[PDB]
Design a protein around this motif. Sequence first.
Motif, short mmCIF file in Angstrom:
data_model
loop_
_atom_site.label_atom_id
_atom_site.label_comp_id
_atom_site.label_asym_id
_atom_site.label_seq_id
_atom_site.Cartn_x
_atom_site.Cartn_y
_atom_site.Cartn_z
N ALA A 69 0.86 -1.17 0.00
CA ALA A 69 0.00 0.00 0.00
C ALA A 69 0.90 1.23 0.00
N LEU A 104 -3.67 6.74 -3.33
CA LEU A 104 -4.93 6.56 -4.07
C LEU A 104 -5.88 7.74 -3.86
N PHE A 129 -6.07 1.68 3.50
CA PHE A 129 -6.09 2.91 2.70
C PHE A 129 -4.71 3.10 2.07
N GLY A 130 -4.67 3.33 0.77
CA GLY A 130 -3.40 3.52 0.10
C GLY A 130 -2.99 4.98 0.09
#
Lengths: 243, 243, 243, 243, 243, 243, 243
Positions: free
Chosen positions: G24, G78, G129-130
Amino acid sequence: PQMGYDRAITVFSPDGRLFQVEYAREAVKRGATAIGIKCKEGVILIADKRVGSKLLEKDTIEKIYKIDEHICAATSGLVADARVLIDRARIEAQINRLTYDIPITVKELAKKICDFKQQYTQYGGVRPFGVSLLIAGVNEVPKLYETDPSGALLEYKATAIGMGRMAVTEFFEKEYRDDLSFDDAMVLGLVAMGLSIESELVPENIEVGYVKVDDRTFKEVSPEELKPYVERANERIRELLKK
Amino acid sequence: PQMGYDRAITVFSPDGRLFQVEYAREAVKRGATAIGIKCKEGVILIADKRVGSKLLEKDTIEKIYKIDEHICAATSGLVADARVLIDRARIEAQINRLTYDIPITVKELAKKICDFKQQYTQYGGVRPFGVSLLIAGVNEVPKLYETDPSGALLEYKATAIGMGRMAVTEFFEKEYRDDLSFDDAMVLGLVAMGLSIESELVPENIEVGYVKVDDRTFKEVSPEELKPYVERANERIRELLKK
Amino acid sequence: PQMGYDRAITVFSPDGRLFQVEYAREAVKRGATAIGIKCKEGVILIADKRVGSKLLEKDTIEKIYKIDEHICAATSGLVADARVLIDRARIEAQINRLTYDIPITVKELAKKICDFKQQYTQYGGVRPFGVSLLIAGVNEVPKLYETDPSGALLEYKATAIGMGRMAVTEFFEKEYRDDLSFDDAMVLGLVAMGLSIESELVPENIEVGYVKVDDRTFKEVSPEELKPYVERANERIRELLKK
Amino acid sequence: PQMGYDRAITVFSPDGRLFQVEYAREAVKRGATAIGIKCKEGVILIADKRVGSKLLEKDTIEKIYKIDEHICAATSGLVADARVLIDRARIEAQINRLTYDIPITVKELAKKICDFKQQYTQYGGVRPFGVSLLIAGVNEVPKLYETDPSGALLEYKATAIGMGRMAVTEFFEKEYRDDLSFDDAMVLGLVAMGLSIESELVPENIEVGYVKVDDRTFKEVSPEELKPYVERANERIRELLKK
Amino acid sequence: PQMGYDRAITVFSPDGRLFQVEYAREAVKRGATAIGIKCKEGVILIADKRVGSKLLEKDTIEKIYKIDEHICAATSGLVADARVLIDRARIEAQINRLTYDIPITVKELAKKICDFKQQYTQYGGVRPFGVSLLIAGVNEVPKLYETDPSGALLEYKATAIGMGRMAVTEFFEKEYRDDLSFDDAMVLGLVAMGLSIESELVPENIEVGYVKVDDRTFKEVSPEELKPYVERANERIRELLKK
Amino acid sequence: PQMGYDRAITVFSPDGRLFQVEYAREAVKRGATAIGIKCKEGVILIADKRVGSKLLEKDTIEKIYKIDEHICAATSGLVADARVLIDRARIEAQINRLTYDIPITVKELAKKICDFKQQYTQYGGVRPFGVSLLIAGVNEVPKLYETDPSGALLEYKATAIGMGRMAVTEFFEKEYRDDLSFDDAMVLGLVAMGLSIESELVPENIEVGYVKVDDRTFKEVSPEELKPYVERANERIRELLKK
Amino acid sequence: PQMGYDRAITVFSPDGRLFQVEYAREAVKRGATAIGIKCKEGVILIADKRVGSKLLEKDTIEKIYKIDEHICAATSGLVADARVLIDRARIEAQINRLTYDIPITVKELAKKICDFKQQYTQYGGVRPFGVSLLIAGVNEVPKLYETDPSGALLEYKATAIGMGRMAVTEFFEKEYRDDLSFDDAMVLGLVAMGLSIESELVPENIEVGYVKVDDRTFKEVSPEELKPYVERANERIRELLKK
């Protein structure tokens, strides 16, 4: 059709496809063909009810189902799945008269059954319905809808589902008229079924239902009221089948 | 029957099939055969109750089950699964008398048990019922239904489930009459069982129940009331078995 | 027994089987054998309680369990699983007296424990109970039931579970009488256990419980009241074991 | 021990086993050995508390745990798992005094902790407890129970868990007396621990707790009150260890 | 595009990517291209509605959807998924007028539909929506948004989705003016569609909708009001297509 | 460390181990070492806070955390996991004062945080915490606890976690005194850290906190109050580091 | 980076790592670089907003987001994931003013968003969560926090995230002063961005926001107020870039 991406409805393939949905579509291909044709004065649904055995109480076989007074429907694909979808449509038709105290439109009904099918397409422990439907009826104008296992919805003037979709489709594609008459639409429909089966029709092994703009009331046609149409239909079927 | 697509009920195969359902059907093939035959005055259910051991309290073995006063049922496939399905039918019959304050029809009952089975067909952590049922009874007219592990429902005039389905089916396919009499239907049914087993019958190792249009009341036939029918049946069975 | 279809309870094999259930049955085969024999005046349960160590408080080992005043039960298979099933039966017996304000019948109890087991057979994250039970008691007439890991239920006149099922079964199959007397049934039962073990019995390493039609009250037999029966039993066991 | 069937607690092997449970049992084998011995006047629990480092606050190490005034318990297997099980037993002991307003029996407590363990044995996303327990106490008579990762429950007169189970078991198997005295039972117990370790004992590296019929009150023995017993024990241990 | 990390939406690849999202993007690439262009006086949406069959009731085909009086939207990718997203937007528009008793802004709507899509991106049994959207409207100033299957949101002056994104994008990239006029923006838009298709346009096989700063009211353009723009557009398309 | 049994926390290996827990332990090995030493008058916690960059606001770095007025704690392993565990301890300390209206003991706190960790060890979709903790404080007597990713709990007199556990442990193992004085314990602790790092200490790159029996109040030592102890510590460290 | 342990967030590798978290982190590396620098009078956030196309409405692109009046934040990784995290922070800021009727501190906010991220790290059907965040603001003193996909939280004096983290970090590592002035910090920050990009800056393609100790009010700097700083910054960037 590539292994590794085709056994889980929630997985996209490298080229952006849902193979489990495409496979589900293979199930509806195996079903008896159901035809739908719309015209100025109404919409018609024709289904093939030929059975492979005389032990089946075909006198009670139903291929065209009444959803509401003005809504009609045909089926193709997994049997049990289909029945469940039709009961769902009926329940949906009743809910509408309760909530809005008015009958649901053909569009809204088809739309609700398709949103339902769409959901059985994006969750992990769920199998998609292996069936397509022809939802027909009359709102302000006649309506003919075709559904897909994925939940896609399309409105047609004339179409078909099941084994003979190709045949019927190409035939209508070459001779369907935007201005045909009810009786013409009826005959054209039977002819299609004919090419589909590659044989003259037998009024007793095909079911026909319809909804006209005047009555807005669904009703099935008796093999007696249907015999004259078959006779005319068989004429052209005979004329076209192997010249 | 292709590995990779046959060990998850929710997965369609490339050619649109549900192999786990087809495999479930292999379970009902192994069961004792149950026959169903309908006629003008009523419907009959005949089941083979031959046991491989004398230690079994066969005096209490039941192959034909009463669902309600007018509804009847036979079973084939996984034992425990079958029992659960029959209790479900009974509960369903009671719920109906409560909700609509009237007896449920044969069609509605069969339909409800099949919708139930259909659901154990499209969810991930669920196994389909490995059984088929013959639901028989009398509404306004006699009724004979055959169920499938997938939830499919079909109405027949005469049919069978279990080991001898093929035999019985072909026999009825060649000699069933749309106008037979109760006693004829009865004999024809026993004959079928006979070919099925390839042996003359023994009234005490076969169970028969029925529902006639007059009484609309289910009742089992005693081996004594049944002996005369077996005698006549064994005559033809003898005559047909190896000429 | 084919890999690929035998490690998930919810998967049917190509020939319609539930291998995980068949494998579960392999667990009950390893248990000490329990025998059940019914007669005119009552039902008897005999279990082998021989232990491999003197450190076990065998003076408190229980192989036959009281479920209710008139219901009795034996076990075979996974130990912990068995205990849970018996507590379940007891709870079930209490619920009945509360709901219907009357004692539950042997049939209904066996039926409820089997419906419970059946459910641990058709859901994905669940393991089936690895045990079989002999439920015995007296309703209007004596009763003997045998359960299966899959939930199947069968009523017998005489039978067995565990290691010696085969032996005991064949023996009863050749010498069980539909008219035996309580004491005869008792002796016949001990003899069976004897062949099963291939050794004369020792009253202190076998447990016997019963329920007669008169009292409808379960009670265990003391090794003293049991010694006379063993003596007679050992006579025939001796006579049959290696002539 | 066959791959393919040994990495999911809910899967039975072809020969009816639960390998994950057998593997869990491998965890308790690695633990310090705990011994349990019962006699006429009470029950005793002896545990090895030798540590590999002097940095451990062994002055606060506990191998024998009080569950209630009359209930006692020892542990073997995964550490964290064990602690959780003991807190569970204590909570269970309190619930009993609340619900029935009376102390729970040793049998009922052991039974409840085992039903709990049994459940962590038949659900998919759950790991079984990697520990065995010795539950000891005095109800109307002294009691000694041994638990298993699968939830099995057995009552013994004398036994052990952990590394030295074999040794201790065979020793008791050859010299345990159904009529020993408290002090005899005590010494016999220490001797066992001795053979187990293959070394004379050191009162400060072994923990002993007990519950006698008179007080029905659990209490640990001080190394001072324990020294005399070790001395006598070491005599025989010395005499038996390498003659 | 490396196997092992591309068949589970929740798994990151070694180089920090979500291949299932990238694969979902491959689905929108296959859709009919939809163009969006913004200017001083308003925002325009142009979609290609050419069908492969005359049997489709194209007279009722909709490529540009009204979300609210001032909000507009186009679609590309999986059909059923798209419809669901648009109904979601409409519902979202209604909720806003209820909760804040005022119309939702274009930004907030796009933002809410994208947060929804983002969630179908980080949970295990969930499939991402295979569609991109062009959300257009007028708040205080004109607005044009482009969505992504992953839930990403970007604001553009001019852009496109579907098959011709590349073509259209490069064209606008070379000739879009920050000061164009509504009619210029319109023509420029049609030209783009032209290059995209590599053919002069046919007003009847392209759908155009818009929202101007004055009315803040969405409205579709009739093929008649649209014909003049196509004529001018085809001029340049002709001039640029193969010099 | 055998593939096939090491990538699912709920799976036991053939030799009864939980490899995912052992792997989690590999995470705490990588952390800065934290030392714990107890004596007559109190308990001390020493942590290494050397950073690899001057950009880190080390003036606000905390390695020793106050849980309650009398409870103290150090950490090692995954950073985010550690923080969550400490907040959990604090919340747990508050809950206690609410429920029992009194401060929680060190033992009970450590015990509650370990029961919590144990649970993240036996459920399928859960990852174990990759951290060990040193919980220190003063109840009636000083207390020092060491936790494990599996939830195991041990009480020590002196110990350590992180990179230098081995070194520190062996050192204390050879020179820890059950009767040391606060200041001796302090110095001995710093020396240990020294060997651990293989370098004389720098008061500003090590954090020390403690709780004495008199105040029962946690407090950190300023680098100024700490400088004298380092000086003395560095003397011996120098003397022992490479003679 | 070893296959077998890197495609499930809940699995530890043999050397105690969470590869899915490390992967990630590879996502945030690809993002435009965001810089954070703190000084005596306040904290500054600088982000690169250069776009690859003129079609993007960059006049509305936001790289620095206001969380509350005194809290500031930058993003990397992201896109959709980032937006969700920022809305979460805002909601969190509002909840605080409701519950404690006072503004949340920078520390508490960063801490809450990180506890949230930590949870998407230890459950099976959840993706981490990236993205990394820079949370900046002024409580009693200026604050600069850096987050990680795993939920780790660190406080810095100066740092960066995204593509140029290395460059920026080493630069600050060699020339950051604990006593710089707001304007110095500003210039130093722009210089860093410069080296990062390896090009003189263009005030219009970089976004700057800040929060000073006096106002405790976040505010963005206009390219006009920013031009003077860039000019000075470009001087040194020019001087350092290729001597």
